[PDB]
mmCIF file of all heavy atoms in Angstrom:
data_model
loop_
_atom_site.group_PDB
_atom_site.id
_atom_site.type_symbol
_atom_site.label_atom_id
_atom_site.label_comp_id
_atom_site.label_asym_id
_atom_site.label_seq_id
_atom_site.Cartn_x
_atom_site.Cartn_y
_atom_site.Cartn_z
ATOM 1 N N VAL A 58 23.877 4.974 30.149
ATOM 2 C CA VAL A 58 25.308 5.307 30.125
ATOM 3 C C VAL A 58 25.521 6.698 29.530
ATOM 4 O O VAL A 58 25.104 6.973 28.398
ATOM 5 C CB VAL A 58 26.075 4.270 29.296
ATOM 6 C CG1 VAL A 58 27.583 4.532 29.355
ATOM 7 C CG2 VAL A 58 25.719 2.865 29.766
ATOM 8 N N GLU A 79 32.831 13.688 36.686
ATOM 9 C CA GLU A 79 32.696 12.496 37.520
ATOM 10 C C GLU A 79 31.464 11.648 37.222
ATOM 11 O O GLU A 79 30.600 12.025 36.419
ATOM 12 C CB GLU A 79 32.692 12.858 39.003
ATOM 13 C CG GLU A 79 34.064 12.701 39.609
ATOM 14 C CD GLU A 79 34.333 11.265 40.030
ATOM 15 O OE1 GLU A 79 33.466 10.350 39.804
ATOM 16 O OE2 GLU A 79 35.421 11.047 40.585
ATOM 17 N N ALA A 80 31.359 10.478 37.869
ATOM 18 C CA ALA A 80 30.286 9.561 37.489
ATOM 19 C C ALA A 80 28.897 10.079 37.858
ATOM 20 O O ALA A 80 27.908 9.670 37.228
ATOM 21 C CB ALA A 80 30.520 8.196 38.139
ATOM 22 N N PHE A 83 28.195 12.009 34.747
ATOM 23 C CA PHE A 83 28.191 11.173 33.545
ATOM 24 C C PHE A 83 26.951 10.270 33.512
ATOM 25 O O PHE A 83 26.289 10.153 32.488
ATOM 26 C CB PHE A 83 29.474 10.356 33.473
ATOM 27 C CG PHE A 83 29.613 9.596 32.193
ATOM 28 C CD1 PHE A 83 29.899 10.244 31.018
ATOM 29 C CD2 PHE A 83 29.463 8.204 32.179
ATOM 30 C CE1 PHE A 83 30.040 9.531 29.828
ATOM 31 C CE2 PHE A 83 29.608 7.472 31.008
ATOM 32 C CZ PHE A 83 29.872 8.137 29.822
ATOM 33 N N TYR A 84 26.600 9.681 34.641
ATOM 34 C CA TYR A 84 25.353 8.939 34.791
ATOM 35 C C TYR A 84 24.373 9.855 35.506
ATOM 36 O O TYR A 84 24.222 9.807 36.723
ATOM 37 C CB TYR A 84 25.570 7.633 35.581
ATOM 38 C CG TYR A 84 26.621 6.761 34.985
ATOM 39 C CD1 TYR A 84 27.916 6.728 35.493
ATOM 40 C CD2 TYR A 84 26.326 6.049 33.837
ATOM 41 C CE1 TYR A 84 28.882 5.961 34.868
ATOM 42 C CE2 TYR A 84 27.288 5.244 33.211
ATOM 43 C CZ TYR A 84 28.556 5.196 33.745
ATOM 44 O OH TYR A 84 29.513 4.436 33.118
ATOM 45 N N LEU A 110 25.570 -0.993 32.172
ATOM 46 C CA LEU A 110 26.756 -1.859 32.300
ATOM 47 C C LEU A 110 27.189 -2.094 33.764
ATOM 48 O O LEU A 110 26.959 -1.264 34.653
ATOM 49 C CB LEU A 110 27.936 -1.297 31.492
ATOM 50 C CG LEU A 110 28.667 -0.169 32.200
ATOM 51 C CD1 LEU A 110 29.679 0.434 31.296
ATOM 52 C CD2 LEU A 110 27.708 0.958 32.636
ATOM 53 N N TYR A 111 27.562 -3.339 34.066
ATOM 54 C CA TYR A 111 27.990 -3.666 35.425
ATOM 55 C C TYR A 111 29.306 -3.027 35.883
ATOM 56 O O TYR A 111 29.483 -2.783 37.085
ATOM 57 C CB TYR A 111 28.096 -5.181 35.541
ATOM 58 C CG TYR A 111 28.153 -5.656 36.957
ATOM 59 C CD1 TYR A 111 27.123 -5.354 37.844
ATOM 60 C CD2 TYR A 111 29.197 -6.467 37.397
ATOM 61 C CE1 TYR A 111 27.132 -5.801 39.146
ATOM 62 C CE2 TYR A 111 29.229 -6.922 38.706
ATOM 63 C CZ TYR A 111 28.198 -6.591 39.576
ATOM 64 O OH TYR A 111 28.244 -7.045 40.870
ATOM 65 N N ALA A 112 30.245 -2.801 34.946
ATOM 66 C CA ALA A 112 31.607 -2.297 35.206
ATOM 67 C C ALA A 112 31.739 -0.866 35.699
ATOM 68 O O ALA A 112 32.726 -0.182 35.425
ATOM 69 C CB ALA A 112 32.451 -2.475 33.946
ATOM 70 N N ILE A 113 30.809 -0.426 36.494
ATOM 71 C CA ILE A 113 30.819 0.982 36.798
ATOM 72 C C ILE A 113 30.969 1.281 38.242
ATOM 73 O O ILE A 113 30.728 0.470 39.146
ATOM 74 C CB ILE A 113 29.658 1.766 36.186
ATOM 75 C CG1 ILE A 113 28.292 1.363 36.764
ATOM 76 C CG2 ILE A 113 29.859 1.820 34.766
ATOM 77 C CD1 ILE A 113 27.258 2.417 36.570
ATOM 78 N N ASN A 114 31.584 2.429 38.411
ATOM 79 C CA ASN A 114 31.448 3.043 39.674
ATOM 80 C C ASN A 114 29.969 3.350 39.766
ATOM 81 O O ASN A 114 29.328 3.729 38.767
ATOM 82 C CB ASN A 114 32.265 4.334 39.578
ATOM 83 C CG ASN A 114 33.676 4.041 39.048
ATOM 84 O OD1 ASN A 114 34.278 3.066 39.446
ATOM 85 N ND2 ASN A 114 34.148 4.832 38.066
ATOM 86 N N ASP A 115 29.459 3.285 40.981
ATOM 87 C CA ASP A 115 28.060 3.554 41.260
ATOM 88 C C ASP A 115 27.033 2.595 40.620
ATOM 89 O O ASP A 115 25.958 3.051 40.235
ATOM 90 C CB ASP A 115 27.812 4.990 40.808
ATOM 91 C CG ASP A 115 28.823 5.944 41.428
ATOM 92 O OD1 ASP A 115 29.680 5.449 42.212
ATOM 93 O OD2 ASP A 115 28.775 7.163 41.162
ATOM 94 N N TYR A 116 27.304 1.305 40.385
ATOM 95 C CA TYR A 116 26.301 0.495 39.673
ATOM 96 C C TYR A 116 24.927 0.555 40.352
ATOM 97 O O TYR A 116 23.904 0.801 39.696
ATOM 98 C CB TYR A 116 26.763 -0.961 39.505
ATOM 99 C CG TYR A 116 25.667 -1.819 38.893
ATOM 100 C CD1 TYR A 116 25.438 -1.813 37.512
ATOM 101 C CD2 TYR A 116 24.882 -2.658 39.680
ATOM 102 C CE1 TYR A 116 24.442 -2.603 36.952
ATOM 103 C CE2 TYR A 116 23.856 -3.419 39.141
ATOM 104 C CZ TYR A 116 23.650 -3.400 37.757
ATOM 105 O OH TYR A 116 22.657 -4.169 37.180
ATOM 106 N N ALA A 135 28.443 -6.518 30.406
ATOM 107 C CA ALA A 135 29.828 -6.084 30.615
ATOM 108 C C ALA A 135 30.254 -6.456 32.029
ATOM 109 O O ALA A 135 30.820 -5.655 32.756
ATOM 110 C CB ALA A 135 30.002 -4.579 30.368
ATOM 111 N N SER A 282 39.510 -1.598 24.264
ATOM 112 C CA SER A 282 38.652 -0.645 24.919
ATOM 113 C C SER A 282 39.118 -0.465 26.354
ATOM 114 O O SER A 282 39.610 -1.417 26.972
ATOM 115 C CB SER A 282 37.202 -1.139 24.908
ATOM 116 O OG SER A 282 36.411 -0.392 25.800
ATOM 117 N N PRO A 283 38.982 0.733 26.909
ATOM 118 C CA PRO A 283 39.313 0.908 28.330
ATOM 119 C C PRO A 283 38.370 0.148 29.237
ATOM 120 O O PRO A 283 38.660 -0.007 30.425
ATOM 121 C CB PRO A 283 39.202 2.420 28.546
ATOM 122 C CG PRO A 283 38.745 2.994 27.301
ATOM 123 C CD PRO A 283 38.771 2.007 26.218
ATOM 124 N N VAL A 284 37.215 -0.292 28.733
ATOM 125 C CA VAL A 284 36.339 -1.159 29.531
ATOM 126 C C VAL A 284 36.943 -2.549 29.721
ATOM 127 O O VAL A 284 36.538 -3.266 30.651
ATOM 128 C CB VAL A 284 34.951 -1.237 28.879
ATOM 129 C CG1 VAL A 284 33.938 -1.999 29.761
ATOM 130 C CG2 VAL A 284 34.447 0.194 28.615
ATOM 131 N N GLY A 285 37.863 -2.967 28.864
ATOM 132 C CA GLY A 285 38.507 -4.265 29.044
ATOM 133 C C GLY A 285 37.917 -5.390 28.250
ATOM 134 O O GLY A 285 38.235 -6.555 28.520
ATOM 135 N N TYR A 286 36.990 -5.109 27.362
ATOM 136 C CA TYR A 286 36.499 -6.099 26.412
ATOM 137 C C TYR A 286 36.722 -5.552 25.021
ATOM 138 O O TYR A 286 36.645 -4.342 24.812
ATOM 139 C CB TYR A 286 35.010 -6.426 26.623
ATOM 140 C CG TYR A 286 34.674 -6.855 28.056
ATOM 141 C CD1 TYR A 286 34.129 -5.949 28.972
ATOM 142 C CD2 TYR A 286 34.938 -8.141 28.502
ATOM 143 C CE1 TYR A 286 33.833 -6.342 30.319
ATOM 144 C CE2 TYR A 286 34.665 -8.540 29.862
ATOM 145 C CZ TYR A 286 34.097 -7.637 30.734
ATOM 146 O OH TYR A 286 33.822 -8.028 32.050
ATOM 147 N N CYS A 309 41.142 12.048 32.624
ATOM 148 C CA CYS A 309 39.864 11.460 33.042
ATOM 149 C C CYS A 309 39.004 12.457 33.793
ATOM 150 O O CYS A 309 39.387 12.883 34.880
ATOM 151 C CB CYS A 309 40.075 10.225 33.911
ATOM 152 S SG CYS A 309 38.495 9.446 34.452
ATOM 153 N N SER A 311 35.095 12.266 33.324
ATOM 154 C CA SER A 311 33.810 11.639 33.575
ATOM 155 C C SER A 311 33.908 10.381 34.443
ATOM 156 O O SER A 311 32.909 10.003 35.053
ATOM 157 C CB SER A 311 33.152 11.295 32.225
ATOM 158 O OG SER A 311 32.919 12.492 31.464
ATOM 159 N N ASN A 312 35.094 9.790 34.582
ATOM 160 C CA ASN A 312 35.253 8.583 35.403
ATOM 161 C C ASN A 312 34.177 7.533 35.120
ATOM 162 O O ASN A 312 33.492 7.031 36.027
ATOM 163 C CB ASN A 312 35.304 8.964 36.894
ATOM 164 C CG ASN A 312 35.749 7.802 37.784
ATOM 165 O OD1 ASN A 312 36.464 6.904 37.353
ATOM 166 N ND2 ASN A 312 35.310 7.834 39.042
ATOM 167 N N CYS A 313 34.089 7.138 33.834
ATOM 168 C CA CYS A 313 32.929 6.380 33.387
ATOM 169 C C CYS A 313 32.974 4.926 33.856
ATOM 170 O O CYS A 313 31.921 4.368 34.192
ATOM 171 C CB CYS A 313 32.801 6.453 31.865
ATOM 172 S SG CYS A 313 34.067 5.660 30.920
ATOM 173 N N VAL A 314 34.142 4.268 33.875
ATOM 174 C CA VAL A 314 34.165 2.816 34.134
ATOM 175 C C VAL A 314 35.280 2.454 35.121
ATOM 176 O O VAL A 314 36.387 3.006 35.061
ATOM 177 C CB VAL A 314 34.300 1.969 32.855
ATOM 178 C CG1 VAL A 314 33.027 2.101 32.020
ATOM 179 C CG2 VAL A 314 35.604 2.348 32.059
ATOM 180 N N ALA A 315 34.990 1.501 36.017
ATOM 181 C CA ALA A 315 35.993 1.102 36.999
ATOM 182 C C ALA A 315 37.241 0.455 36.414
ATOM 183 O O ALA A 315 38.338 0.756 36.920
ATOM 184 C CB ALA A 315 35.370 0.183 38.062
ATOM 185 N N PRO A 316 37.170 -0.431 35.404
ATOM 186 C CA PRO A 316 38.410 -1.083 34.913
ATOM 187 C C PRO A 316 39.455 -0.115 34.393
ATOM 188 O O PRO A 316 40.644 -0.444 34.392
ATOM 189 C CB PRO A 316 37.904 -2.006 33.783
ATOM 190 C CG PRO A 316 36.485 -2.308 34.188
ATOM 191 C CD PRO A 316 35.970 -1.015 34.779
ATOM 192 N N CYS A 317 39.053 1.071 33.939
ATOM 193 C CA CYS A 317 40.028 2.013 33.392
ATOM 194 C C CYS A 317 40.940 2.600 34.456
ATOM 195 O O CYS A 317 42.093 2.954 34.154
ATOM 196 C CB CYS A 317 39.294 3.144 32.682
ATOM 197 S SG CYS A 317 40.330 4.407 31.901
ATOM 198 N N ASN A 318 40.494 2.660 35.716
ATOM 199 C CA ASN A 318 41.308 3.297 36.756
ATOM 200 C C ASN A 318 41.648 4.748 36.436
ATOM 201 O O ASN A 318 42.809 5.151 36.436
ATOM 202 C CB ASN A 318 42.577 2.508 37.092
ATOM 203 C CG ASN A 318 43.277 3.039 38.303
ATOM 204 O OD1 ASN A 318 42.689 3.681 39.182
ATOM 205 N ND2 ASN A 318 44.600 2.859 38.313
ATOM 206 N N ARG A 319 40.607 5.529 36.145
ATOM 207 C CA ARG A 319 40.688 6.989 36.001
ATOM 208 C C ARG A 319 41.717 7.400 34.942
ATOM 209 O O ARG A 319 42.503 8.336 35.134
ATOM 210 C CB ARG A 319 41.055 7.605 37.353
ATOM 211 C CG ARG A 319 40.036 7.385 38.481
ATOM 212 C CD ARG A 319 40.162 8.390 39.646
ATOM 213 N NE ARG A 319 38.991 8.316 40.510
ATOM 214 C CZ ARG A 319 37.953 9.135 40.471
ATOM 215 N NH1 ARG A 319 37.854 10.066 39.542
ATOM 216 N NH2 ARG A 319 36.991 9.007 41.388
ATOM 217 N N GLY A 320 41.759 6.660 33.838
ATOM 218 C CA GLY A 320 42.580 7.035 32.704
ATOM 219 C C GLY A 320 43.738 6.090 32.452
ATOM 220 O O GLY A 320 44.344 6.142 31.372
ATOM 221 N N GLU A 321 44.070 5.210 33.398
ATOM 222 C CA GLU A 321 45.218 4.337 33.180
ATOM 223 C C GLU A 321 45.071 3.539 31.892
ATOM 224 O O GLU A 321 45.996 3.470 31.042
ATOM 225 C CB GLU A 321 45.365 3.366 34.367
ATOM 226 C CG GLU A 321 46.514 2.359 34.165
ATOM 227 C CD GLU A 321 46.597 1.293 35.235
ATOM 228 O OE1 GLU A 321 45.776 1.280 36.201
ATOM 229 O OE2 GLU A 321 47.552 0.476 35.126
ATOM 230 N N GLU A 322 43.897 2.911 31.736
ATOM 231 C CA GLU A 322 43.764 2.026 30.597
ATOM 232 C C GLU A 322 43.453 2.818 29.336
ATOM 233 O O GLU A 322 43.830 2.404 28.232
ATOM 234 C CB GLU A 322 42.718 0.942 30.843
ATOM 235 C CG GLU A 322 43.001 0.042 32.110
ATOM 236 C CD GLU A 322 44.389 -0.605 32.181
ATOM 237 O OE1 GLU A 322 45.029 -0.811 31.154
ATOM 238 O OE2 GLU A 322 44.749 -1.034 33.294
ATOM 239 N N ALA A 323 42.740 3.945 29.483
ATOM 240 C CA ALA A 323 42.504 4.789 28.319
ATOM 241 C C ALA A 323 43.825 5.226 27.693
ATOM 242 O O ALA A 323 43.979 5.171 26.465
ATOM 243 C CB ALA A 323 41.671 6.005 28.751
ATOM 244 N N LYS A 325 46.656 3.635 27.867
ATOM 245 C CA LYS A 325 47.311 2.469 27.248
ATOM 246 C C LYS A 325 46.674 2.113 25.913
ATOM 247 O O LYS A 325 47.374 1.878 24.922
ATOM 248 C CB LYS A 325 47.236 1.256 28.183
ATOM 249 C CG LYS A 325 48.343 1.292 29.223
ATOM 250 C CD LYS A 325 48.289 0.119 30.188
ATOM 251 C CE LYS A 325 48.190 0.608 31.574
ATOM 252 N NZ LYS A 325 47.839 -0.537 32.465
ATOM 253 N N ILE A 330 36.799 6.290 26.241
ATOM 254 C CA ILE A 330 35.547 5.913 25.554
ATOM 255 C C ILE A 330 34.399 6.881 25.855
ATOM 256 O O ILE A 330 33.588 7.202 24.970
ATOM 257 C CB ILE A 330 35.114 4.481 25.939
ATOM 258 C CG1 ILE A 330 33.940 4.037 25.040
ATOM 259 C CG2 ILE A 330 34.819 4.382 27.402
ATOM 260 C CD1 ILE A 330 33.489 2.579 25.256
ATOM 261 N N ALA A 331 34.362 7.437 27.070
ATOM 262 C CA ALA A 331 33.354 8.433 27.411
ATOM 263 C C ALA A 331 33.461 9.653 26.500
ATOM 264 O O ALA A 331 32.458 10.108 25.916
ATOM 265 C CB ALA A 331 33.506 8.814 28.883
#
Side-chain angles (χ1 to χ4, degrees):
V58 185
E79 263 276 3
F83 187 72
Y84 305 100
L110 80 187
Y111 196 58
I113 66 159
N114 309 318
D115 307 359
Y116 174 81
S282 166
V284 187
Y286 306 99
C309 180
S311 298
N312 192 27
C313 67
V314 292
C317 181
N318 190 24
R319 297 200 167 261
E321 177 186 359
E322 302 307 335
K325 277 179 237 168
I330 189 176

